[PDB]
Amino acid sequence: MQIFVKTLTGKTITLEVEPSDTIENVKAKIQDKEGIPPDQQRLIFAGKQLEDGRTLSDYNIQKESTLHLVLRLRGG
Template sequence: RTPGGFTIFVVSMSGKRVALEEMSSSDTVKNLRSRIQEEEGTPIHKQRIVFNGHQLEDERCICDYNIGKGDTVHLVLQLSGGGYSIMSTLSDLSGTENAEAS
């Protein structure tokens, strides 16, 4: 954690929103997932993080995705059978946004 860092918001598929404070642009996605596990108890291996329609890769820094102060990432959970469909999830998200706009 970086004292004086910034806050990133995490929104789950259920709509729950959590603030992760003291984040740094040099934090990796894996660090972000560790913080989510600390705050929410969601195991790292079940988390998929999405920002601007892209699934984030563990070894990259959040700055690689232009994630900064006040940004919101989406938490998608991997199903216990090992499968999940990130594309259908993203499609569902954009369908909801389109429906709200009409």
């Protein structure tokens, strides 16, 4: 399914992935399109950050839901 990701500035981008796709691959696709590194790229949904070892069905992501795409403060 496709998800609507919202960047810090409010930029809305749609990402096409599979239900059995892990968040890590989703990040990789975003790193392919926009070029945002999967490491600094922080995805928050429902108040919880999306881990790499998680699928779309893991967080029970709603079809075309609002995913928060932000960065990180502490690098180490």
